[PDB]
């Protein structure tokens with residue numbers, strides 16, 4: 001199989017990309033623990049900034065943002081109790097210094113505040129403090145996954161919680177927050193899990209003049225639950241194309257309002273992840289999902305990091321690295337300084353090829369073999385690229401022993417031979433770069449099942 005690399009961006013290219021499309025979401029209550037108690041956080045984020053030149057954008061939110069109340073007179077960043085360190089708190093408070101800690105991050109920061117408890121004055125005070133403390137503030141969410149609120153939540157005001165109820169609530173909360181802050185272009189609106197029963201298409205229809213308050217429209221996407229866990233299905237190249245397709249309408253609806261779309265919270269599987277979430281294959285999902293989502297028109301994807309020590313989809317923890325970080329790293333490397341990406345394949349098979357442009361010139365090609373592999377002879381697929389200049393190209397390979405490979409259990413993936421230190425996220429090992437001949441403007445590469453290859457032109 002053979003892909004031509006066009007000399008300028010194809011018609012099915014992505015829009016002009018963000019300086020750092022691969023971002024990170026941190027569970028609200030846990031954010032200070034990530035900054036204070038998890039030495040890998042600093043280095044894992046610095047490694048990605050080292051590739052792209054831009055700090056990964058971050059988002060601080062999740063279900064616990066709708067369990068949280070702002071305490072203007074607390075000198076604590078976050079105050080809560082849990083019976084078991086693996087549990088998320090049922091209630092918590094956060095001080096101004098929570099926003100101050102967010103404000104120490106140099107990359108774009110999105111922070112999520114509470115709408116479920118209907119404490120509008122308290123959320124307005126939190127928003128004003130966020131604007132004062134967070135120089136790199138990007139956006140503020142007013143409620144997380146409002147599609148999961150019910151008639152028993154304060155925000156529902158003793159009436160059924162419907163899509164229409166949410167959309168009207170969001171307009172009122174956008175107007176109150178922005179009116180109080182004399183602000184516009186600030187709110188990360190929707191924040192919906194999937195596209196039903198609430199959608200960006202429905203919300204945008206209702207926003208009217210409240211769109212000037214919106215910074216971006218936000219979707220959450222988790223392809224699987226612990227119950228639908230299937231690693232082959234997750235990482236499948238054509239399966240990813242199907243999986244994201246319902247969001248195309250959402251992206252269209254945001255961009256029609258001249259507002260970017262984001263996946264402001266996304267990861268492989270729900271409830272902190274299941275048995276497939278810590279695997280290399282989940283990293284390969286992440287890599288390909290990022291590329292397809294950006295071509296679809298999303299600006300940024302923010303990959304969720306949950307309870308410290310009880311999070312299967314996390315890129316890192318206190319003591320160990322996670323296989324999925326390799327997908328985030330490789331994605332960041334593929335996109336670094338790039339203006340555009342285009343799909344060279346038709347997304348009907350397991351095999352992907354993407355041309356990556358800078359200044360409307362092809363600079364890299366990303367190749368992906370999504371075939372699932374755990375035992376026996378490992379299959380492979382040859383990829384031929386045409387329209388190349390020169391005598392030679394270089395490549396870096398992402399591989400591991402198996403689709404199931406976990407860093408714990410000692411089957412760390414490698415990115416061009418390198419790994420990341422448990423407990424620090426420091427880069428380890430000698431980088432190996434592959435060479436391939438160019439003859440008649442053609443080069444051929446071989447990817448084993450469950451591999452990716454980044455070719456530099």
Ligand SMILES: *[C@@H]1O[C@H](CO)[C@@H](O)[C@H](O)[C@H]1NC(C)=O
Pocket residue numbers: 120121122124175176177178179180
């Ligand atoms: C600001 O917030 C309050 C709720 O605290 C709301 O009643 C009021 O209408 C808001 N003011 C403006 C100007 O939007």
Ligand SMILES: *[C@@H]1O[C@H](CO)[C@@H](O)[C@H](O)[C@H]1NC(C)=O
Pocket residue numbers: 010011012343344345346347
């Ligand atoms: C993108 O367009 C190219 C032609 O320029 C076509 O070969 C390829 O299949 C297309 N891919 C998709 C996913 O539309």
